[PDB]
Amino acid sequence: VPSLTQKKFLCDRTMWRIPFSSNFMSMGALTDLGQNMLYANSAHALDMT
Amino acid sequence: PAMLAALQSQPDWAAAMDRILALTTRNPEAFRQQPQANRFSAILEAVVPSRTNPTHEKVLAIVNALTESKAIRKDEAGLIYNALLERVARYNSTNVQANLDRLTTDVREAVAQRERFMHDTNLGSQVALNAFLSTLPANVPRGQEDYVSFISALRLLVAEVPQSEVYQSGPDYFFQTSRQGLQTVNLTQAFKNLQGMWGVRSLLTPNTRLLLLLIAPFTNSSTISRDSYLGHLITLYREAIGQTQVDEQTFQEITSVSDTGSLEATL
């Protein structure tokens, strides 16, 4: 009888990251971008959804 | 004893504003390339240097001095250091925090005496001997006055062999060492058995013979003449020393050519 594929993606014990750098990568700590808003006593405000 | 405190702590500002400014020689293009985090954590240093607190350092510049001369043993500079710090962390003030500074910049400089202490052995060689020579009999022995030449050769020996040549006063009897090893310990209150032959022409216990053999090298035409025994022996001991040098080089040569062997037809 006809098929309507469903499809999922279990993942357990792993915390989705979103590393915050540019080439969303990992080239160190004090990651690229971060390094910018260093000295500059600047201030901001996220608001993810 | 200070740079050992410098080279145990304190990881400059001229060398920092000489590199950020790019005024070095080898690789001027060094500070420019670092991540823009470092270049903003080394520019705000040679623009407004951060103060320091030097106490520990120069206090560690005093401990490393004590334990190198000999007070506070090597294994106690963890109680001495804390005690000194806490004392100087109580009564501190421009008073003490300076009185240190002088102590630390003088103890490393007033080390010349210490150097002298080990360059004429004027710690246990001449102060002791020039004490023992004051315990000798009067300086007018009956027989001869070759006495003084011998007693001066003794001082010259002690002054020109810094190796150790310590002069103990191991109780009533002052005894001459020939080296820290001490395998020629001759008793120097037991040559009041030379205030006998000081002037004549088997009564010498080798102890006296040991002293003669010990100084002989440093005698020339001094103890002199055929002043008996004391004269010759000194000359014969010097002759034997020369022959011993000869035989020493000979034996090294004859054992480098190749077992008793040489030891027989050398001795």
* Domain end point (choices B96, B120, B144): B120
Q: B44 at the A interface (CB within 8 A)?
A: yes
Asked if A36 and B36 come within 8 Å (Cβ–Cβ), the reply is yes
Domain holding B139, by residue range, is: 124-267
Between the alpha carbon of residue B170 and those of residues B121, B133, B161, the distances in Å are: 18, 16, 21
Selection from B75, B84, B79 nearest residue B57 by Cα: B84
Same domain, B63 and B169: no
Same domain, B116 and B199: no
Distance, in Å, from the CA atom of B12 to the CA atom of B23, rounded to the nearest integer, reads 15
Distance, in Å, from the CA atom of A4 to the CA atom of B180, rounded to the nearest integer, reads 99
Pair B80, B66: CB distance under 8 Å: yes
Same domain, B28 and B154: no
Q: Which structural technique was applied?
A: cryo-EM
CA B52 to chain centre: 38
Q: At A8, which helix (H) or strand (E)? A: none
Q: At B176, which helix (H) or strand (E)? A: strand B175-176
* Domain end point (choices B99, B120, B141): B120
Looking up tokens 């996220």 gives: A46
User: In this structure, how many other beta carbons lie within 10 angstroms of the beta carbon of residue B87?
Assistant: 12
Interface of B with A in 192-231 (CB under 8 A): none
Same domain, B53 and B143: no
CA dihedral sign, ordered B78, B84, B87, B92: negative
Using alpha carbons only, what angle is made at residue B244 by residues B194 and B230, rounded to the nearest 5 degrees? 15
Asked if B35 and A36 come within 8 Å (Cβ–Cβ), the reply is no
Same domain, B153 and B265: yes
Same domain, B188 and B98: no
Same domain, B100 and B193: no
Q: At B101, which helix (H) or strand (E)? A: helix B96-107
With residues binned 3-state (H G I as helix, E B as strand, rest as coil), the percentages for chain A, rounded to 5, are 10, 0, 90
What is the least distance, in Å, from the CA of B27 to any CA of chain A? 25
Number of structural domains found in chain B: 2
Asked if A35 and B44 come within 8 Å (Cβ–Cβ), the reply is no
Pair B177, B185: CB distance under 8 Å: yes
Same domain, B138 and B227: yes
* Selected residue of A22, A37, A38 to mutate for chain B interface (largest B Cβ count, 10 A): A38
Same domain, B93 and B167: no
CA dihedral sign, ordered B69, B74, B77, B80: negative
Same domain, B112 and B138: no
Distance, in Å, from the CA atom of B185 to the CA atom of A11, rounded to the nearest integer, reads 86
Task: Give burial (CB, 10 Å; 0-12/13-18/19+) of B223.
Answer: buried
Same domain, B168 and B129: yes
